């Protein structure tokens, strides 16, 4: 019944999403459409909208905030897939493959441009302070991730930092900016804000877990993609610590000497060690963030909207619950 309440809005933002991409440029219109047509769970607008519906209020700002977040989210994906060399997206070809590198970079900046155009209406420094801050942070996270490739060890703090910027904060901004465009009170804003942050953390851990556990079918790319590109994630970290407990530090030695030119045999070894030793601690950690998000949901006033958020919390974190 939650896809019924957001039904009129999801189709509204979708309509405006296609409006925002209209361009007198031939390729860009095609390219923008290409990724905008590609799947999309629109989970960020769903947080924006629901966060604004916590208190009794109506604004045209609310639904247009959601539109902008999606545009920024998709702007990051186009650029991402070109940087990461990915050729697939939920079963759809990536823009740099379907078109070329130049189009891929242009369309990314184009989406960011229109996303910022869309919210330029909202005359509010705090709003833009928050939004521009998270965008900067996402970049910072990407810089750190790129420098952390094939560089062991990665501290637990640095890992949390990494997954915070690349997933958690944009979702936290969704709940925060949504709460602003509805003048929600500080007590209720804090809880939904921390809900968004914790749900994003938990979700990104799950994603990192799936990189090891799942098959190429639900991934769309080889199992162990993160480590094959040098990315050290908590599942690997946890697996290493467990083996050291059993006095076995061979995995540690292998990862330390890991290089961009490493043989597939070394990756296959790493993958299986992670599957055997790193999955459960990663699930445990993910659960902590999930349970923390539940607490913040339970502390906000009982209402209809609360139930929708709770049902999204069950869906997104199903792999751990």
């Amino acid at each position: 019944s939650y896809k019924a309440f957001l039904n009129p809005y999801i189709i509204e933002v979708e309509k405006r999403l296609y409006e925002c991409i209209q361009s007198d440029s031939e390729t860009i219109n095609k390219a923008a459409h290409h990724i905008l047509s590609s799947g999309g769970k629109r989970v960020r607008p769903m947080f924006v909208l629901l966060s604004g519906f916590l208190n009794d209020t109506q604004k045209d700002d609310l639904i247009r905030t959601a539109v902008s977040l999606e545009l920024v989210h998709m702007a990051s994906l186009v650029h991402d897939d070109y940087i990461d060399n990915s050729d697939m997206r939920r079963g759809n070809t990536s823009v740099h493959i379907a078109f070329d590198k130049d189009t891929a970079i242009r369309t990314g900046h184009f989406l960011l441009a229109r996303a910022l155009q869309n919210i330029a209406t909202i005359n509010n420094s705090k709003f833009h302070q928050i939004f521009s801050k998270t965008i900067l942070e996402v970049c910072f996270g990407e810089f750190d991730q790129m420098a952390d490739r094939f560089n062991y060890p990665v501290s637990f703090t640095a890992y949390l930092r990494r997954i915070n910027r690349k997933t958690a904060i944009l979702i936290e901004a969704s709940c925060h900016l949504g709460a602003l465009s509805s003048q929600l009170d500080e007590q209720s804003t804090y809880h939904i804000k921390q809900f968004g942050h914790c749900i994003g953390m938990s979700y990104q851990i799950i994603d990192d877990i799936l990189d090891y556990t799942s098959d190429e079918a639900t991934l769309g790319k080889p199992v162990g993609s993160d480590i094959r590109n040098g990315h050290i994630t908590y599942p690997l970290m946890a697996a290493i610590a467990n083996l050291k407990e059993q006095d076995d530090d061979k995995l540690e030695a292998v990862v330390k000497h890991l290089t961009s030119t490493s043989d597939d045999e070394v990756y296959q070894y790493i993958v299986s060690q992670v599957k055997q030793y790193g999955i459960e601690p990663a699930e445990l950690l993910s659960r902590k963030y999930g349970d923390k998000a539940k607490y913040h949901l339970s502390q906000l006033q009982d209402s209809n909207i609360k139930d929708y958020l709770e049902e999204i919390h069950e869906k997104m974190l199903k792999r751990v619950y």
Partner: protein, 135 residues
């Protein structure tokens, strides 16, 4: 060197010092001299220089420098947005975000034209994209 130039060069040098994958190419000398004399705040001049350099870096993106250059154009875009947000320069924001949209449009259409005069004219429009609205 103006005040605004010191401001952005300080912030960029801090980024290169902190994030090794941020690469800072030189600002366009012609666009600096023009921005110097623009009748706007220190913050708007920074945003202009940031977003201008961002888009110009677009042309230098290889396969050998992409995991550096792509992200670097994105902080420069994020900086641009950061410079116009506290306080919120609404008018300058609407103008320049439009410029960002249009300059990407002109660069696409540029890829599909060989005519001589049409090339010289569109390039002119692309080079001066972010400073014309202020003249």
């Amino acid at each position: 060197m103006m005040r605004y130039l010191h401001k952005i060069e300080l912030e960029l040098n801090r980024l290169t010092s902190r994030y090794p994958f941020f690469k800072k190419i030189a600002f366009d000398a012609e666009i600096i001299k023009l921005v110097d004399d623009l009748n706007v705040d220190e913050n708007v001049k920074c945003a202009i220089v940031a977003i201008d350099t961002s888009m110009r870096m677009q042309d230098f993106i290889n396969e050998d420098n992409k995991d550096s250059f792509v992200l670097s154009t994105d902080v420069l875009s994020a900086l641009f947005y950061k410079y116009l947000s506290q306080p919120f320069y609404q008018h300058d924001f609407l103008v320049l975000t439009d410029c960002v949209s249009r300059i990407n449009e002109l660069k696409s259409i540029r890829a599909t034209i060989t005519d001589e005069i049409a090339l010289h004219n569109i390039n002119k429009q692309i080079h001066y994209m972010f400073i014309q609205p202020y003249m």
